[PDB]
């Protein structure tokens with residue numbers, strides 16, 4: 104149960120969604136970009152916290168923040 | 184529901200543990216045109232079948248690790264399910280039937296802040312309040 | 323002249339007073 | 354000169370080899 | 385063909401069917417240990433487990449303990465070690481039973497757990513186990529204490545010295 | 548306001564909610580005594596009750612009994628007192644269980660009794676209790692007997708006299 | 711000397727309380743303190 | 753002599769194995785060998 108907030112500085116480069124190993128992010132239509140897209144995080148209980156989405160965001164001081172919060176059984180990735 | 188023939192695999196040690204049938208469990212289901220061999224996300228190698236393939240994995244990251252491997256075999260028809268122990272099977276990937284890199288209609292901006300990240304409020308503003316600085320209904 | 327045999331036991335029951343007053347306060351701070 | 358103290362124990366663990374090879378064969382003949 | 389199969393035929397399970405866990409001899413030995421023997425009340429599971437352990441636990445303290453130098457005092461130091469190890473062990477499984485069985489045990493003791501390596505999943509079954517483990521490990525400790533403090537009297541009767 | 552309430556909010560009940568019976572500490576202590584601990588088989592209720600009593604019952608006879616003058620004989624007189632008190636006590640609760648559980652127990656053991664201060668209302672529950680009380684009060688008596696007849700050997704090892 | 715003794719008054723009192731607070735009471739204490747950190751909020 | 757002894761090496765070994773194979777192990781063995789001759793074919 105992390106918190107992946109997306110800010111208005113996205114450019115719809117789509118790179119944050121590809122890096123996510125757990126499919127937390129996905130693109131929705133938007134208008135504040137030439138791409139007309141913005142990241143959204145509908146599945147954040149699945150967020151593992153790897154911040155691999157933040158490494159891919161190219162906007163300077165990146166538009167997507169993982170906010171490591173209450174860690175549960177699927178946000179810590181336990182197979183046992 | 185879910186069905187398919189399991190790949191040729193001699194069984195591993197990295198597979199399902201007691202969390203599989205107690206909390207919940209995942210299943211990736213894909214169709215292959217060829218009888219080739221893929222790397223198991225739980226260590227090892229398995230031979231994927233000719234028709235409908237079914238594989239049980241402990242956590243969702245393994246399924247999308249394997250799903251990202253299937254795209255290197257030019258297979259993009261895989262579906263990831265989530266099996267609760269009581270038995271019902273949810274469809275979770277791809278959630279709308281199209282892959283999340285693609286943009287649909289009807290999807291909603293969820294956890295979107297309509298401000299730059301730079302003007303999140305200071306922690307003193309939300310002092311002794313339920314919210315954090317990053318939800319922050321201002322702007 | 324060290325303290326007598328009884329003076330040790332007197333301290334034992336006297337120190338039982340802050341022993342329970344600690345329970346007073348630890349539970350009142352809602353453990 | 355009788356056999357040493359250790360030579361008895363060496364025979365004990367050596368004879369454990371046909372002790373298990375008898376289990377090999379008795380169960381393989383489907384007891 | 386291959387002797388190492390997937391564990392009960394499911395390749396996705398995190399185990400292997402190996403000569404150590406899935407052999408006709410190895411299954412016959414483990415599944416008839418008192419922890420797993422079919423047909424035992426949990427008291428008889430713990431009673432037989434307890435006595436096997438109280439018996440051998442007095443050993444390592446009566447010959448390499450601090451009291452080993454004398455004879456009558458060595459046996460006391462070995463018995464009480466088995467008393468203390470077992471009492472603290474049976475304290476462990478009373479508080480294990482309290483803290484795991486609280487409505488829906490998170491793990492291998494859930495109602496839908498289907499686990500064979502630990503079949504005591506009830507808290508009616510873990511309480512007779514505690515009594516068996518305790519009374520067993522106490523009687524085993526005493527029996528190994530009585531046989532050791534009477535060793536000179538017992539060495540004579542297994543040597544024919546008593547005619 | 549007032550700290551003394553009607554007993555569980557019913558003014559007509561013949562009791563009071565008082566700091567001695569209805570306190571967070573006092574309820575936590577009494578309701579976790581082995582007589583009342585949630586999650587115990589009746590055997591483990593009696594086993595833990597028994598050992599607490601067999602242990603201390605050997606005391607009042609080995610130092611102010613008739614045999615206190617000597618050493619080896621004092622411990623026998625204290626052990627057998629705990630043997631006799633417990634055997635007659637466990638005789639008492641076998642015949643208590645026979646004579647109260649006879650179809651509709653007149654009193655606090657009726658089916659519609661809803662009494663918390665005595666939860667053993669079955670005669671399947673009072674028979675494991677008898678076994679626990681007996682085997683407990685016997686083991687406690689022996690353990691306090693073994694620790695007392697070996698007191699000189701035990702006084703040395705808690706004083707470092709055994710190096 | 712070859713024993714633990716006490717010239718101080720009530721010298722019998724370390725004899726029993728050093729075993730008590732150090733290896734007789736803690737395992738009951740660690741059990742009580744264990745039952746408190748692992749109780750359901752139901 | 754008035755005792756069973758052994759001049760041979762490891763003379764302690766008959767001391768324990770004559771009781772073992774003759775009156776300590778057989779009743780476990782006759783119990784295991786009993787459970788095998790009286791098992792249901794289900």
Ligand code: CLA
Pocket residue numbers: 439440442443444445446447448527528529531532535538771776780
């Ligand atoms: C640090 C390690 C350590 C040390 C120092 C010891 C030290 C000792 N052990 Mg021990 N032991 C150990 C580890 C250790 N053990 C481990 C890891 C196990 C496996 C669980 C055992 C299992 C074991 C057994 C079974 C016995 C010992 C015994 C002894 C004592 C030997 C007494 C003797 O020589 O004459 C005396 C020898 C006898 C009196 C033998 C008489 C025959 C007995 C009654 C038969 C045993 C019961 C029988 C098998 C019941 C069947 C049950 C089932 C197995 C079929 C000695 C103090 C013996 C003992 O406790 O003395 C009372 C003994 O019987 N040990």
Ligand code: CLA
Pocket residue numbers: 602603605606607608609610611690691692694695698701729734738
């Ligand atoms: C007429 C009244 C009377 C008399 C004459 C006695 C006389 C005696 N009592 Mg007793 N007692 C009484 C009433 C009486 N008691 C009452 C009303 C209670 C409350 C139930 C007790 C509880 C009690 C306990 C717990 C003990 C005694 C012990 C003794 C003996 C002292 C032995 C000694 O000095 O050195 C020897 C001292 C020791 C060997 C202490 C060693 C440490 C022990 C093993 C720790 C005790 C177990 C531990 C607390 C387990 C935890 C369980 C749980 C409480 C957490 C002595 C004969 C001791 C005894 O029985 O000796 C074996 C002893 O431990 N008494």
Ligand code: CLA
Pocket residue numbers: 634635637638639641642681
């Ligand atoms: C030969 C028969 C026999 C024997 C050896 C025993 C033995 C025993 N009984 Mg038992 N009992 C018996 C018959 C017997 N009983 C009968 C017929 C009844 C129904 C009334 C009972 C009801 C009973 C209860 C309710 C309890 C026992 C209990 C016990 C045990 C503890 C001792 C005791 O409390 O005395 C009690 C004995 C009685 C209340 C009745 C005894 C009457 C029989 C006929 C004995 C007569 C003996 C004879 C007069 C003297 C010969 C021996 C003497 C010379 C040494 C003990 C091993 C206790 C137990 O459960 O242990 C854990 C206990 O709670 N018994």
Ligand code: CLA
Pocket residue numbers: 333334335337723724725727728731
């Ligand atoms: C905090 C101060 C303090 C400290 C560090 C100690 C330390 C010690 N005492 Mg103690 N003691 C104290 C206060 C203290 N005492 C007071 C005020 C009394 C009068 C009743 C005693 C009476 C006493 C006796 C009779 C004995 C000791 C003994 C000992 C020694 C062994 C440990 C033990 O069994 O004690 C047992 C503890 C008590 C008897 C009660 C003391 C607890 C005090 C009152 C409060 C401590 C709680 C602390 C403030 C909270 C911190 C907890 C946590 C946050 C860390 C040890 C050096 C033993 C000894 O002599 O060694 C050879 C011995 O048998 N003391």
Ligand code: CLA
Pocket residue numbers: 364365366368765766767769770773
């Ligand atoms: C079949 C040959 C044979 C025979 C008839 C005996 C006979 C005897 N031996 Mg043994 N022994 C043997 C082989 C044999 N031995 C071998 C090869 C070793 C080397 C490990 C030993 C080591 C040994 C020791 C240390 C001791 C004996 C002792 C004894 C005597 C008491 C019984 C006993 O406890 O033995 C115990 C049995 C063993 C230690 C294992 C021997 C089993 C052999 C290896 C195979 C026998 C199985 C047989 C072939 C199958 C037939 C079963 C059925 C069909 C009838 C007894 C006279 C005791 C003694 O000295 O008496 C005073 C003693 O303590 N023996």
Ligand SMILES: CC1=C(/C=C/C(C)=C/C=C/C(C)=C/C=C/C=C(C)/C=C/C=C(C)/C=C/C2=C(C)CCCC2(C)C)C(C)(C)CCC1
Pocket residue numbers: 435436437439440519522523524526527530
């Ligand atoms: C795995 C295996 C093995 C091992 C085994 C072991 C590990 C061992 C052991 C063992 C043991 C370890 C045994 C034991 C025992 C015991 C006993 C036998 C007991 C007892 C007891 C008793 C009898 C008691 C009684 C009593 C009581 C109860 C109370 C009162 C008191 C008295 C004392 C009376 C081998 C390799 C060899 C082979 C096979 C398999």
Ligand SMILES: CC1=C(/C=C/C(C)=C/C=C/C(C)=C/C=C/C=C(C)/C=C/C=C(C)/C=C/C2=C(C)CCCC2(C)C)C(C)(C)CCC1
Pocket residue numbers: 467471518519522523525526598599600602603682685686687689690693
């Ligand atoms: C109320 C209260 C109190 C009190 C308490 C008391 C009253 C006490 C006590 C106590 C006691 C009183 C304790 C005890 C104990 C015990 C034990 C710990 C036991 C044991 C045992 C054993 C271990 C046994 C064993 C055996 C058997 C079983 C059989 C065989 C033989 C033998 C021996 C081995 C006070 C105020 C303080 C505080 C808190 C609360």
Ligand SMILES: CC1=C(/C=C/C(C)=C/C=C/C(C)=C/C=C\C=C(C)\C=C\C=C(C)\C=C\C2=C(C)CCCC2(C)C)C(C)(C)CCC1
Pocket residue numbers: 433473474476477479480517740741743744747
């Ligand atoms: C069945 C079986 C068994 C079992 C075992 C078991 C199952 C167990 C357990 C147990 C347990 C379950 C345990 C334990 C424990 C606990 C502990 C060890 C604790 C503690 C503590 C502490 C350390 C604490 C700390 C703290 C806290 C957290 C609070 C605050 C403060 C302080 C820091 C103090 C036996 C071997 C007997 C027998 C045979 C088989």
Ligand SMILES: CC1=C(/C=C/C(C)=C/C=C/C(C)=C/C=C\C=C(C)\C=C\C=C(C)\C=C\C2=C(C)CCCC2(C)C)C(C)(C)CCC1
Pocket residue numbers: 596636637639640642643680
């Ligand atoms: C749980 C409990 C308990 C319990 C207790 C009880 C519950 C009891 C009881 C009991 C009982 C329940 C009893 C008793 C008794 C009886 C008697 C004591 C009797 C008698 C007798 C007589 C005296 C008689 C008389 C007569 C008659 C009536 C007939 C005619 C003739 C003549 C006159 C002889 C105990 C502490 C252990 C442990 C812990 C807790």
Ligand SMILES: CC1=C(/C=C/C(C)=C/C=CC(/C)=C/C=C\C=C(C)\C=C/C=C(C)/C=C/C2=C(C)CCCC2(C)C)C(C)(C)CCC1
Pocket residue numbers: 331332334335337338340341342344347348
């Ligand atoms: C009665 C009697 C007696 C006895 C006595 C005794 C045996 C005792 C005891 C006991 C003791 C020896 C005690 C004590 C104590 C304790 C204390 C004093 C404590 C503490 C602590 C504290 C201070 C706390 C703290 C805290 C708080 C504040 C809150 C929360 C956290 C904590 C927990 C940290 C005699 C015979 C003498 C006399 C007569 C009768």
Ligand code: SF4
Pocket residue numbers: 109112113114115116117118119120141142159160161162165166167
């Ligand atoms: S959050 Fe970053 S990676 Fe994702 S669309 Fe916006 S700018 Fe691109």
Ligand code: SF4
Pocket residue numbers: 107122123124125126127128149150151152153154155156157169
């Ligand atoms: S932290 Fe990892 S799982 Fe979570 S949104 Fe970022 S990339 Fe995806």
